[PDB]
Amino acid sequence: MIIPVRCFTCGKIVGNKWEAYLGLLQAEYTEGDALDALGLKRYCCRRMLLAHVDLIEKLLNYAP
Amino acid sequence: WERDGAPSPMMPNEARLRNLTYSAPLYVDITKTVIKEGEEQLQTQHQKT
Amino acid sequence: YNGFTGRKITSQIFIGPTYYQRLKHMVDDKIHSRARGPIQILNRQPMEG
Amino acid sequence: SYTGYNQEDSVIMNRSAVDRGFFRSVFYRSYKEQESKKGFDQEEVFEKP
Amino acid sequence: TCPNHPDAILVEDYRAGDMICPECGLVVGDRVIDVGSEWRTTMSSSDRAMMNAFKEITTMADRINLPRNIVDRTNNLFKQVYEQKSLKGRANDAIASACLYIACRQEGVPRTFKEICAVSRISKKEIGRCFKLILKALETSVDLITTGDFMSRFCSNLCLPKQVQMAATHIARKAVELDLVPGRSPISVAAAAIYMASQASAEKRTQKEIGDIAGVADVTIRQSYRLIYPRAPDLFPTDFKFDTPVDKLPQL
Amino acid sequence: YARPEWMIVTVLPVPPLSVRPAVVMQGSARNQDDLTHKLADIVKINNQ
Amino acid sequence: MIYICGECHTENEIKSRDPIRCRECGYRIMYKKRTKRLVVFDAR
Amino acid sequence: LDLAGPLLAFLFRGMFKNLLKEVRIYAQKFIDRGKDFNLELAIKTRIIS
Ligand SMILES: [Zn+2]
Ligand SMILES: [Zn+2]
Ligand SMILES: [Zn+2]
């Protein structure tokens, strides 16, 4: 639902890169370029953001 | 329809949560004509039965 | 490289990202044991209790 | 074939990945209970015995 | 029944379904408890007549969309009345209609005698006669109805906004509190209050419209409205938005 | 071990309570087994 | 004994005997409030 | 392929027939007494619901 804190494979921090990744994509960055800019070199950490589905955003559309 | 009989629209989630069937009331217009073997005819219709 | 010894594995391994699914079948929902349990009254035979 | 623990359609998982939320899931069980006043002789209500 | 512990409260056990001495450990009875079930974890005339009345009760209920619990309550009233047999002369349909009326009153959602009559072949006069008899036979009583017991149904059936319904309830309750309508039927007071509240909002309902749902002749609504009209500003809630100013409410 | 006359049911046996137990349902309402209902019918006709 | 309305989200104290309904909303779906008892989680 | 429509139309055909079979019975009984009948009371709503 929400971006994992760590990369599952290696434990690298990924929970502080989702908003930065979305911001870069809005800046016309390709997904590969945006991941490179954030320092995600290993394809395990790129997998984390490339495949993340942010369901929490739609979960917040339901009134508590 | 509540206990007091006040109708309210039923959202599907309320039907799921309260275990209510999701049904729509069905109304039919009915025309009733009566003949009294006295060469008189009376036609009455019950709208939305 | 071997995790336990750190030595290169002689054969090179095919490794990459693959999409995996977790199926509803967990072992905890299936593990069950019986040892002098609640027999039935009429049949005097085992039953779930 | 790492340690023989994935043989015959078995899988070796990474414990550290599991520690980080890998394939962690939630199980929701819902129980519904209603109180029925049917029958003057017998009646049931919600209250801690 | 511990042989060592005479009169000992044996403790039930769900592991194997046996009762054990609470302070010895001895299992008295091997697996006798039956844990699984113990814990949740050619028709007689009287029955045939009862069955038809039960069918009639359900048929009446669906016409006005009453919940099954009231129907279940109505069935119990009918069985008590049918068993006691003080209404043997009265028709079963009349008894059932009165039982349906009583069941509604007992549950806090009264239906007026006219509403029960509309769903039954039995007239209001006959239902009222049966209603009193059933109370005597069952030695029971029903709380006196109030003007607010019909606001939800009447206002909703009129498609009036919630604020109007609250305003009408406040008006009707205040009018009874102020004794502006002594002796008037609660339904008439409610109908007049609905008209007063309705005319003060965007959604305006004529006297005929309010009478139809409430079953009160417009003349009676006119009489009650005239009695509460003088104190219109006082009856209305303080925090009420007047689409039509109170000073300009219809006079009649 | 067997005689033709014994085939005719002159005296009807009654199964023990173990064969047909008194089930408990809806509280203390002992739900008699199907055999009990037939046995209750059998005795009523026999007495009549 | 606090119940939260499912529509207006209004906390209201309701007894066991009295009927279940929103004090002001009229909504008949109510949710129990979170327990005040403290439950510990291992962040594992 | 029989979808919800055709399947439900088959049911409604029979249920409406029972409804119209019922109003005949109720209406005829009142007509036999000679008194006029009320259409709304004749209709049994539970049949289709
Ligand atoms: Zn990684
Ligand atoms: Zn002992
Ligand atoms: Zn509410």
Dihedral (Cα; B19, B21, B22, B26), 10-degree rounding: -150
Q: How many residues does chain B have?
A: 49
Task: Measure Cα distances from D10 to C2, D6, D39 in Å.
Answer: 20, 4, 57
Q: Quick one: CATH architecture of E44-141?
A: Orthogonal Bundle (1.10)
Task: Measure Cα distances from D13 to A46, C27, D49 in Å.
Answer: 20, 15, 47
d(CA E93, CA E121): 8
Concatenate the DSSP letters of all residues of C1-49 into one string.
--TTT-PPPSSPP----------S--STTT----SS----SSS------
d(CA E84, CA E1): 46
Cα-only R_g, chain F: 15
d(CA B43, CA B29): 13
Under 8 Å between Cβ of B46 and B32: yes
Sign of the alpha-carbon torsion through B6, B7, B9, B10: positive
Place of tokens 């336990």: C4
Q: Ligand nearest E23 Cα, by number?
A: 2
The closest of E153, E96, E101 to E121, measured between CA atoms, is E96
Place of tokens 């490794």: C15
| Domain of residue G32, residue span | 1-44
Query: G28–B2: do the CB atoms touch at under 8 Å?
Result: yes
State both tokens at E179. 């004794």
Helices (H), E65-185: 68-84, 92-106, 113-118, 124-138, 151-157, 162-178
H→E contacts (Cβ < 8 Å), by residue, are: 38, 40-41, 44-46, 49
d(CA E98, CA E104): 10
Under 8 Å between Cβ of G3 and G20: yes
Distance from CA of D18 to the nearest CA of G (A): 10
The closest of E209, E127, B30, E113 to H37, measured between CA atoms, is B30
d(CA E171, CA E191): 11
Place of tokens 């971006």: A3
Residues G6-36 as b or e (16 or more Cβ within 10 Å = b): beeeeebeeeeeeeebbeebbbbbbeeeeee
Q: State yes or no: A7 annotated in a binding site.
A: yes
Start and end residues for every CATH 1.10.472.10 domain found in chain E: 44-141, 142-249
Under 8 Å between Cβ of E212 and E202: no
Q: How was this structure determined?
A: cryo-EM
Q: Is the CB of residue E73 less than 8 Å away from at least one CB of chain D? A: yes
What's the first-to-final CA gap in chain G, in angstroms? 32
Ion ligand 3 neighbours, Cβ < 5 Å? G 5, 7-8, 10, 22, 25, 27
CA F12 to chain centre: 9
A27 CA distance to ligand 1 centroid (A)? 24
Q: How many domains does chain G have?
A: 1
Q: What is the largest CA-CA distance in chain G?
A: 43
Under 8 Å between Cβ of B48 and B29: yes
d(CA E10, CA E19): 5
d(CA G26, CA G19): 11
Distance from CA of B35 to the nearest CA of H (A): 12
d(CA A9, CA A11): 6
State both tokens at E198. 């309705």
Phi, psi for residue E186 in degrees, rounded to 5: -55, -35
Q: State yes or no: G22 annotated in a binding site.
A: yes
G5 CA distance to ligand 3 centroid (A)? 4
E186 CA distance to ligand 3 centroid (A)? 28
Residues 5-44 (G) with a CB less than 8 A from some CB of D: 16, 44
Q: Ligand nearest G25 Cα, by number?
A: 3
Concatenate the DSSP letters of all residues of B10-35 into one string.
--HHHHHHHT----------EEEEEE
State both tokens at D43. 């009646």
Residues of A in contact with D21 (CB under 8 A): 4-6, 8
d(CA E195, CA E206): 7
d(CA E197, CA E177): 17
The closest of E93, E83, E81, E85 to E126, measured between CA atoms, is E93
Per DSSP bridges, beta strands B41-46 and G30-32 are: unpaired
Q: State yes or no: E222 annotated in a binding site.
A: yes
State both tokens at C20. 């995996």
d(CA B22, CA B13): 10
Q: Order of strands, edge to edge, in the sheet holding G2-5?
A: G11-13, G2-5, G30-32
Place of tokens 């239906």: E111
Q: Where in the sequence numbering do the catalytic residues of D fall?
A: 9
Residues ≥6 apart with Cβ < 8 Å to F45: none
Q: Is the CB of residue E66 less than 8 Å away from at least one CB of chain B? A: yes
| HEC-encoded secondary structure of E150-197 | CHHHHHHHCCCCHHHHHHHHHHHHHHHHHCCCCCCCHHHHHHHHHHHH
E164 CA distance to ligand 3 centroid (A)? 18
Phi, psi for residue E48 in degrees, rounded to 5: -60, -45
The hierarchical CATH code for the domain E142-249 is: 1.10.472.10
A42 CA distance to ligand 1 centroid (A)? 6
Cα-only R_g, chain G: 13
Place of tokens 């906004």: E161
Query: D46–G44: do the CB atoms touch at under 8 Å?
Result: no
Under 8 Å between Cβ of E167 and E240: yes
Best of E30, E35, E40 to disrupt the C interface (most C CBs within 10 Å) is E35
The closest of B17, B27, B23, B16 to B1, measured between CA atoms, is B23
Residues of E in contact with H44 (CB under 8 A): 59
Under 8 Å between Cβ of E133 and E91: no
d(CA E193, CA E209): 14
Residues of H in contact with E118 (CB under 8 A): 40
Q: State yes or no: G24 annotated in a binding site.
A: yes
Angle between helices E162-178 and E186-199 (to 10 degrees): 130
Show the CA angle centred on residue A56, arms to residues A54 and A59, nearest 5°.
Answer: 130
D19 sits in which H/E element? helix D15-19
Task: Measure Cα distances from E210 to A31, B7, E220, E222 in Å.
Answer: 66, 17, 11, 11
d(CA E34, CA E36): 6
Q: Give the count of alpha carbons within 13 A of A29, CB side only.
A: 16
Under 8 Å between Cβ of C8 and E3: no
- Map residue E36 onto helix, strand or coil: helix
